[PDB]
């Protein structure tokens, strides 16, 4: 019967499920693609020059009020006065550039710094009189007099826009407003100032800040928990939406990249600096051998390398995700008892200290349990075929375990393992080998009964019959 380790893997593989025809929080559930279409419903975008595959947009920071600011009512019916104008401070300008960079990283847009003034396609400025929201922007389908503008509230009562920084609301606000200027709408038909919207007004269940920075709703609505942090950069559904609009950026981070601790991304939101770092990010990466390094955390973590999957990292829930179309190869756990789930390619998974559960999935994986009693789980023969077996790099008999309980043959076929020294043409025969000189071992199983191994696992260290579950 399926062990608890196998059950934990299965449960996490199906965590944060999306799609289908059942109600979730009183709303229909949408897949990433369905949500992306919803976010793009306005059908507004900047036009690329004929033939150009890359859209180039400039930006500038206003130094004085413009026509809209002076006479709002001539452009929008609801706004009569914006109060007093103020230019973006150095802090705001620096943070704005990081937000713009986070959008250009994922799609084919090149942002050009046009400096101080009103010459940029995109412009930024502050206002002091509350218009029912922290900031506002215009979608690209408005008159040239309003196109590309985003405005931010700064007054004695509201200070979130004064100090934007990685992980805070001010930084997410910049990313959110820039998203509007590029053509993205909120995931549902709601807006600050129009009635009194709540999550009950969302069109689909996944309209939360766990999936889109364009959402107004807390991540807890969908089961995630960022402990007060806010995503600084585009999330899973934002990436899907913007790429459908301007294309996927296939040159971003094409080298071997490390996310988390020891990051070489040069992106504040992808970097962990201490065991206290609250990470919230969705990985966009165009190539190379990449690694999710979460070695510096001591909390129990659940890491899933499959595209579109969410992971529970550094004490938060559903805070790390991998964008659709991205292949991340390796993952390193921390000192807690972690769950590491690989994907279809060859992965290097390292559990570190703690009693970890590792699941390589398809491909010939290199698995390191590290210190502690680790369990290497298998759910299908194909996951470690005789032709491309996994290698358990630091197996310690009596401590670690090889778990085969979830295989169909044992759960359903009622097969019983019979250890022998040579195959004789009988299903279920297994050969456990160990060369004490090289310290290399092996487990080979003939499930078909043709005297040819169908499943095999290479070992560095000895494994005994007592180390193999079911």
């Amino acid at each position: 019967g399926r062990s608890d380790a196998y059950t934990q893997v299965d449960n996490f593989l199906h965590a944060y499920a999306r799609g289908g025809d059942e109600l979730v929080n009183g709303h229909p559930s949408y897949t990433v693609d369905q949500a992306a279409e919803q976010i793009l419903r306005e059908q507004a975008s900047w036009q690329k020059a004929p033939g150009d595959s890359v859209l180039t947009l400039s930006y500038s920071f206003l130094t004085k009020p413009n026509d809209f600011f002076n006479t709002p009512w001539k452009y929008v019916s609801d706004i009569y006065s914006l109060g007093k104008f103020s230019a973006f401070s150095a802090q705001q300008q620096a943070q704005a550039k990081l937000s713009l960079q986070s959008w250009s990283d994922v799609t084919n847009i090149h942002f050009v710094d046009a400096g101080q003034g009103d010459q940029g396609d995109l412009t930024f400025g502050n206002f002091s009189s509350s218009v029912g929201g922290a900031a506002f922007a215009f979608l690209p389908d408005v008159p040239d007099a309003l196109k590309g503008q985003s405005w931010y509230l700064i007054n004695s009562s509201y200070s979130a826009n004064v100090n934007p920084a990685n992980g805070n609301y001010g930084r997410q606000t910049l990313t959110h407003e820039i998203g509007h200027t590029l053509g993205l709408s909120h995931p549902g038909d709601y807006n600050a100032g129009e009635g009194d919207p709540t999550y009950a007004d969302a069109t689909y269940a996944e309209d939360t800040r766990a999936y889109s920075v364009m959402s107004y709703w807390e991540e807890q609505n969908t089961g995630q928990d960022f402990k007060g942090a806010y995503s600084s950069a585009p999330l899973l559904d934002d990436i899907a939406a913007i790429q459908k609009l301007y294309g996927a950026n296939l040159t971003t981070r094409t080298g071997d990249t490390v996310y988390g601790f020891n990051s070489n991304t040069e992106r504040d939101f992808y970097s962990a600096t201490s065991s206290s770092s609250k990470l919230v990010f969705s990985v966009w990466d165009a190539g190379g051998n990449d690694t999710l390094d979460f070695s510096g955390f001591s909390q129990n973590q659940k890491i899933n390398l499959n595209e579109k999957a969410l992971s529970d990292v550094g004490g938060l829930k559903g805070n790390v995700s991998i964008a659709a179309g991205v292949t991340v190869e390796n993952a390193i756990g921390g000192s807690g008892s972690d769950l590491l789930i690989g994907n279809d390619v060859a992965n290097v998974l390292k559990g570190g200290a703690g009693n970890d559960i590792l699941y390589g999935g398809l491909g010939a994986d290199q698995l390191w349990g590290g210190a502690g009693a680790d369990t290497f789980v298998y759910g299908d023969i194909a996951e470690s075929s005789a032709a491309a077996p996994d290698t358990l790099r630091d197996f310690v008999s009596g401590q670690d375990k090889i778990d085969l309980s979830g295989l169909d043959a044992f759960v359903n076929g009622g097969l019983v393992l019979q250890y022998v020294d040579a195959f004789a043409g009988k299903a279920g025969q297994a050969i456990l080998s160990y060369d004490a000189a090289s310290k290399a071992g092996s487990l080979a199983i003939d499930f078909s009964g043709d005297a040819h191994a169908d499943f095999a696992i290479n070992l560095i260290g000895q494994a005994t019959q007592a180390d193999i579950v079911v």
Partner: peptide, 4 residues
């Protein structure tokens, strides 16, 4: 038209 003023999207917050």
């Amino acid at each position: 038209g003023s999207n917050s």
